[PDB]
Design a protein around this ligand. Structure first.
Ligand SMILES: CO[C@H]1O[C@H](CO)[C@@H](O)[C@H](O)[C@@H]1O[C@H]1O[C@H](CO)[C@@H](O)[C@H](O)[C@@H]1O
Ligand SMILES: [Ca+2]
Ligand SMILES: [Mn+2]
Length: 237
């Protein structure tokens, strides 16, 4: 299977697989069953911002998700990602819907990874920023139902022409270039990601969420990973 590290914005409590009984943000290390969660107020129809931060010094993967009214949720988890991820990864966004649904609209996404080795600024770095997506976004690998639009957005999961999100959808977007996420001689290996998103649902209980994830370079949507598996995992183990 793929190796996945993810920050999930999980809109739908699947309490049978260890979700807390509320929408939550979570840090997922090789399992959809978050190692750490925090209660999250998803604001229907509002634009949220997720920030994900990690560095190999503090070895603490942190995320905050906020809305313009100042509400936010944060989760941090101490983890040495050297021992979790392969040296080379791809980074992406993933989302799903299920029996319940929501738009999983990404309005922007940025990412920075740096490897700072030994001495003065001999550093490798990758940064990308999308504040507008184009219909044919050649530097994104779109998987599943994910599309980019003339509207400038990345719709991770299916949305009708009429703007209605569809159930049973899963989609991801990975940045085209592999990322050298850590390296043995790197004194600091850090990454940061930010994305903004608009989750809107007619459903009184939207589902299923959006994740920022880091995976092996050849990561693909696992079979049967709509709904609670967020397009990240082949099962709920
Ligand atoms: C009730 O459980 C389903 O829906 C929730 C909310 O969307 C998901 O978290 C959960 O994984 C289940 O989704 C599966 O079943 C749905 C139909 O019941 C289907 O639409 C989904 O694609 C998924 O297979
Ligand atoms: Ca869930
Ligand atoms: Mn969860």
């Amino acid at each position: 299977a793929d190796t996945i590290v993810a920050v999930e914005l999980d809109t739908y409590p699947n309490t049978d697989i260890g979700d807390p009984d509320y929408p939550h943000i979570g840090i997922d290390i090789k399992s959809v069953r978050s190692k750490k969660t925090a209660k999250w107020n998803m604001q229907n129809g509002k634009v949220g911002t997720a920030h994900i931060i990690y560095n190999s010094v503090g070895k603490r993967l942190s995320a905050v998700v906020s809305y313009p009214n100042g509400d936010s949720a944060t989760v941090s988890y101490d983890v040495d990602l050297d021992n979790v991820l392969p040296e080379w990864v791809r980074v992406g966004l993933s989302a799903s819907t299920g029996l319940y649904k929501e738009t999983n609209t990404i309005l922007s996404w940025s990412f920075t990874s740096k490897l700072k080795s030994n001495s003065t600024h001999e550093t490798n770095a990758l940064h990308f920023m999308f504040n507008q997506f184009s219909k044919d976004q050649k530097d994104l690998i779109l998987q599943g139902d994910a599309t980019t639009g003339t509207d400038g957005n990345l719709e991770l999961t299916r949305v009708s022409s009429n703007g209605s999100p569809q159930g049973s959808s899963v989609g991801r977007a990975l940045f085209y270039a592999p990322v050298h996420i850590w390296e043995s001689s790197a004194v600091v290996a850090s990454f940061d990601a930010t994305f903004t998103f608009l989750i809107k649902s007619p459903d009184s209980h939207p589902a299923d969420g959006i994740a920022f994830f880091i995976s092996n370079i050849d990561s693909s949507i696992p079979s049967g990973s709509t709904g609670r598996l967020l397009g990240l995992f082949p099962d709920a183990n």
